[PDB]
């Protein structure tokens, strides 16, 4: 059984900067099992304070083993995937486990308007999850 | 503020449990709020096939929620804690809510008398609960 699904997360007014190092924003829950995304706009910790950290969390309790490959990307103004980062294998998700990237994208890259990744100051993240069971 | 308490549960004739996957045994209730333990001798589900699953259940609560950390261990023949598993952080309990570990210990480990954890065919579990 293969189940692939996605979620698009729009974070408005991203430049507002009301989340300090270690602080988190969580997305609404989604499914194809319930999942959510968690982002640290100023990094998970001191070694990552210069990056957005981004994680996929399994919220619900599965009945059988869940392994998932995941890919996170940023959508530009044309809706195209850019700066994608993909898990190098399927990871085991149990209830309450997250997996992701502590250094998903540089804050100083994302925040510079010229790179075009915050159109109307909106950060749009796209998460694709391929579940095998 | 912390309120920490414990319960010891001895299950006799453990090797004779007829519970199939998904079936459950619950303990008597205890308190320092009423709680009990629940075990699935043959696992909760497919993910936990061939494990004993172990849970803390909040049976009765006068308010909406309780936050608690918990630790389960198996007491060996000397009464010592072994094969412990702990929540690490506090979990949110409401009346009727359980939290625990579906893969608490392999059934085939527990059931082999040679590991010494079923003296006289008795399983002794020890739960420590910290309401924080």
């Amino acid at each position: 059984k293969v189940v692939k699904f996605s979620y698009m997360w729009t974070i408005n007014n991203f430049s507002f900067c009301r989340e300090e190092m270690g602080e988190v924003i969580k997305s609404s829950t989604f499914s194809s099992l319930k999942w959510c995304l968690r982002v640290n706009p100023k990094g998970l910790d001191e070694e990552s304070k210069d990056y957005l950290s981004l994680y996929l969390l399994l919220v619900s309790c599965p009945k059988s083993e869940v392994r998932a490959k995941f890919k996170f990307s940023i959508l530009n103004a044309k809706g195209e995937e850019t700066k994608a980062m993909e898990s190098q294998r399927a990871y085991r998700f149990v209830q309450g486990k997250d997996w992701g990237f502590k250094k998903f994208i540089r804050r100083g890259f994302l925040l510079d308007e010229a790179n075009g990744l915050l159109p109307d100051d909106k950060l749009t993240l796209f998460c694709e999850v391929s579940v095998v069971q | 503020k912390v309120v920490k308490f414990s319960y010891m549960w001895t299950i006799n004739n453990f090797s004779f449990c007829r519970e199939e996957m998904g079936e459950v045994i619950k303990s008597s209730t205890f308190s320092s709020l009423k709680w009990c333990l629940r075990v699935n001798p043959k696992g909760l589900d497919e993910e936990s096939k061939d494990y004993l699953s172990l849970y803390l259940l909040l049976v009765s609560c006068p308010k909406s929620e309780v936050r608690a950390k918990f630790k389960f261990s198996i007491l060996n023949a000397k009464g010592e804690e072994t094969k412990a598993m702990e929540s690490q952080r506090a979990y949110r309990f409401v009346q009727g809510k359980d939290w625990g570990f579906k893969k608490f210990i392999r059934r085939g480990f527990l059931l082999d008398e040679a590991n010494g954890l079923l003296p006289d065919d008795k399983l002794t579990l020890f739960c420590e609960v910290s309401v924080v």
Binding site: R38, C61, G96, D98 | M85, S87, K97, D98, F101
Partner: peptide, 11 residues
């Protein structure tokens, strides 16, 4: 990367 270690509980 994961933000947790140890044993997440289920329920």
């Amino acid at each position: 990367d994961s933000t947790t270690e140890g044993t997440p509980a289920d329920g």
